């Protein structure tokens, strides 16, 4: 995995040694090449993963996440060029370094073979992520959002540290391949009930699980566009990717320990989906939407059937592109009216004919319109939850109706009706913005032609 | 608010409009409409306002009892089928300032004449501001009405938006 | 119950302004100033040909445009679909399945030449 780690590091010298006025051109151009080479990770097999060395390995679950990870950094550079225009040159380069450093830790998290190496890198993404929110947010509440973001994560991560070291002492290894053959059943006792909780709580805070999600509406809403995209697209998928790997060594206790969490997630869908109906803030409507989409992923992971695992992997990729695309669309309006209120600017379809098409495509993908890969991922989860219990169809179906509302409600409120009379700085869409949306939707709709590459290791 | 002279006339208009929906046929409408005018004429010059008020209050409750549940509404009035239909084609004027220079080249006469209007607004603004400062009460405006143009050559205060409003059928 | 003397004054001043704006919305004969365009040779032979509304000329144009459409929208695609169906689709197992054709008494089997016995004699119906 050095063919992708070293090039990413070389983006740091590249940014600092480039001309003053070409920091964006070089980083944007060269980081797309790194994204292009990531397709060589698709060399998967039907029975074995890509075991590069004693440290790094890649399988059908990590591969789609790596490609999504290395594909966003170019998009996060494109989005940031506006609000960083009037900024010190050195600071404009540290910001790019934080994005480059963040990607560096991510490509090693999804490929780490040893769970303690996973934990450190999984935990190291807090620093660059925390710095982006607090230093380059636009509000007073970014300072408080970084505290909520930091301590919600650590409060759950530190117990996970004790569990992994305990497992190594009593097993002898945390290498993931070893645990596949040395895994032993988890007997039902009070000691294990606090090892199951310790292992899972760290990731369920980052999904986030309903109830422990109060940090997300603060972090995503207050962070800059570049931070919001990665926070919603790839960072939430650390939690899901963690559960998909840690659950290997938590059987057969996961069958009854999941009840408090499945019930929270199944009902939390309707709670967070309904919140989006009465949201004044456009960026906060998208943030709450993320919690409702990750509620399905938690449920799929905890019932442990191949359909749920295949669907769960597809929701993570499908939501990654959709949630990031919405944040860019919502941010484009912000850069004109400089306000996050949803009702402030209306009738923008008569003023921005093309930008209103992306809203249509972003919304239609958000509400899982078939045959998009949102529907494919969301269907397999519903199919597998029905086999778990027929009654769940009521909750899954109810959440679908509400999702169809807060998506098209967002579309109608801002893109339809009479324009606001007193807003006259609605300049046409720049070529940068239109290309930024085309880079979200087009990859997302192409995957419908070959969906098998995002259906996880259970395909 | 409304004066009792106004409230009667408005009730008279609604009674006819709902009567037209019930009657449908013009000949029948002309019949019952004449009878209604008689009912409104027999109290044309009532003296005591208290009895006059009691007539309006009783008249209203009769209208609500017989009002048409689906009264006829003109197509483009609030509640009409064509209401707000063309609002999507009513682009504002400031959107022309963003046109690419190539686009403005296709209508040289229009934009050149548009520039005359823009200078007309720009030059007369500083005067219009004073025209309202002087004529307003000390505390502030007490009503929504604007003064006309008094001195020759000055345009009425607050004219640009109501003069350049989009056409009712832009396309 | 009517315009105040100052009310009509503002309306008259605003109204006269409004007409001039609407008057200015007119387009001069020159506008729009369309730029140059590289025109196709084929249309030239038609614009000159269709200068007059000759009835016989219209038919030739009518048949010409229809023929072009029937070739680039019906003939080419069916070649592609038939080529796609014949040598890539039908060559796979259980890809195209046809309901087995119905067989009636007395029929002749084309494949093997079998003869199906007719039905038993119907005694009588008359009516």
């Amino acid at each position: 995995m050095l063919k992708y780690i070293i090039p990413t590091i070389m983006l740091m010298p590249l940014t600092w040694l480039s001309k003053n006025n070409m920091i964006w051109v070089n980083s944007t151009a060269h980081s797309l090449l790194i994204s292009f080479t990531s397709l060589l990770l698709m060399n998967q097999f039907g029975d074995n993963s890509l075991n590069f060395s004693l440290l790094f390995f890649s399988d059908s679950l990590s591969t789609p996440l790596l490609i999504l990870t290395m594909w966003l950094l170019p998009l996060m550079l494109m989005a940031s060029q506006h609000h960083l225009s009037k900024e010190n040159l050195t600071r404009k380069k540290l910001f790019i370094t934080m994005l480059i450093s963040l990607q560096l830790f991510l490509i090693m998290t999804f490929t780490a073979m040893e769970l303690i190496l996973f934990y450190i890198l999984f935990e190291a993404t807090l620093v660059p992520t925390l710095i982006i929110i607090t230093r380059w947010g636009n509000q007073t509440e970014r300072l408080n959002a970084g505290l909520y973001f930091l301590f919600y994560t650590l409060a759950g991560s530190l117990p996970l540290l004790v569990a992994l070291i305990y497992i190594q002492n009593t097993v002898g290894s945390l290498n993931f391949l070893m645990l596949q053959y040395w895994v032993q059943p988890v007997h039902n006792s009070w000691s294990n009930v606090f090892m199951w909780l310790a292992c899972m709580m760290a990731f369920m805070v980052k999904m986030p699980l309903y109830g422990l999600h109060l940090w997300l509406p603060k972090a995503h809403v207050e962070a800059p566009i570049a931070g919001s995209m990665v926070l919603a697209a790839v960072l939430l998928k650390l939690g899901g990717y963690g559960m998909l790997r840690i659950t290997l060594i938590l059987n057969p206790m996961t069958d009854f320990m999941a009840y408090p969490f499945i019930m929270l997630s199944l009902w939390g869908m309707i709670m967070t989906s309904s919140i989006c109906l009465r949201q004044t803030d456009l960026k906060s409507l998208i943030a709450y939407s993320s919690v409702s989409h990750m509620a399905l992923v938690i449920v799929a992971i905890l019932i442990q059937t191949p359909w749920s695992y295949m669907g769960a992997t597809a929701l993570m990729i499908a939501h990654g592109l959709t949630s990031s695309m919405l944040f860019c669309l919502a941010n484009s309006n912000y850069e004109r009216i400089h306000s996050r209120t949803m009702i402030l600017a209306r009738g923008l379809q008569t003023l921005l004919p093309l930008m209103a098409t992306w809203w249509l495509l972003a919304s239609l993908t958000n509400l899982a319109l078939p045959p998009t890969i949102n529907l494919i991922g969301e269907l397999f989860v519903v199919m597998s939850t029905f086999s778990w219990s027929n009654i769940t169809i009521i909750l899954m179906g109810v959440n679908m109706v509400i999702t169809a509302l807060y998506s098209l409600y967002m579309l109608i409120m801002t893109q339809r009706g009479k324009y606001t009379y007193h807003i006259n700085n609605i300049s046409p869409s720049f070529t940068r913005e239109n290309a930024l949306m085309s880079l979200h939707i087009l990859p997302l709709l192409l995957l419908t032609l070959n969906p098998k590459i995002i259906l996880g290791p259970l395909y | 608010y409304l004066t009792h002279q106004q409230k009667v006339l408005r009730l008279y208009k609604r009674a006819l409009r709902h009567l037209e929906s019930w009657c449908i046929h013009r000949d029948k409408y002309r019949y019952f409409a004449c009878l209604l005018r008689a009912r409104f004429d027999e109290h044309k010059n009532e003296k005591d306002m208290v009895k006059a008020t009691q007539l309006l209050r009783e008249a209203e409750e009769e209208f609500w009892h017989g009002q048409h549940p689906q009264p006829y509404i003109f197509p483009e009035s609030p509640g009409g089928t064509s209401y707000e239909r063309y609002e999507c084609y009513k682009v504002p004027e400031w959107c022309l300032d963003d046109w690419h220079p190539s686009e403005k080249a296709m209508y040289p006469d229009y934009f050149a004449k548009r520039e005359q209007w823009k200078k007309l607004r720009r030059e007369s603004w500083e005067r219009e501001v004073k025209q309202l400062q002087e004529e307003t009460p000390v505390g502030g405006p007490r009503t929504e009405a604007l003064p006309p143009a008094r001195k020759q050559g000055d345009l009425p205060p607050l004219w640009w938006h109501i003069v350049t409003r989009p056409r009712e059928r832009p396309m | 119950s009517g315009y105040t003397p100052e009310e009509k004054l503002r309306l008259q001043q605003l109204r006269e302004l409004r007409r001039r704006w609407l008057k200015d919305q007119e387009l001069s004969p020159r506008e729009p100033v369309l730029p140059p365009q590289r025109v196709s040779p084929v249309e030239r032979f038609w614009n000159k040909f269709l200068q007059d509304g000759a009835l016989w000329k219209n038919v030739i144009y009518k048949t010409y445009r229809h023929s072009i459409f029937a070739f680039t929208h019906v003939l080419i695609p069916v070649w592609i679909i038939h080529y796609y169906l014949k040598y890539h689709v039908t060559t796979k197992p259980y890809t195209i399945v046809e309901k087995k054709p119905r067989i009636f008494p007395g029929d002749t089997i084309l494949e093997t030449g079998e003869v199906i016995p007719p039905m038993k004699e119907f005694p009588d119906q008359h009516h």
Binding site: T350, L351, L352, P353, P428, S429, F430, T431 | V91, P92, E93, C95, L96, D98, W99, H100, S102, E103, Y107, Y110, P166, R167, P170, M171 | Q25, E26, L27
Partner: peptide, 12 residues
Amino acid sequence: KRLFIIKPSGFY
């Protein structure tokens, strides 16, 4: 009578 249509800039 060939009035001018006010529409947003479609060039971009």
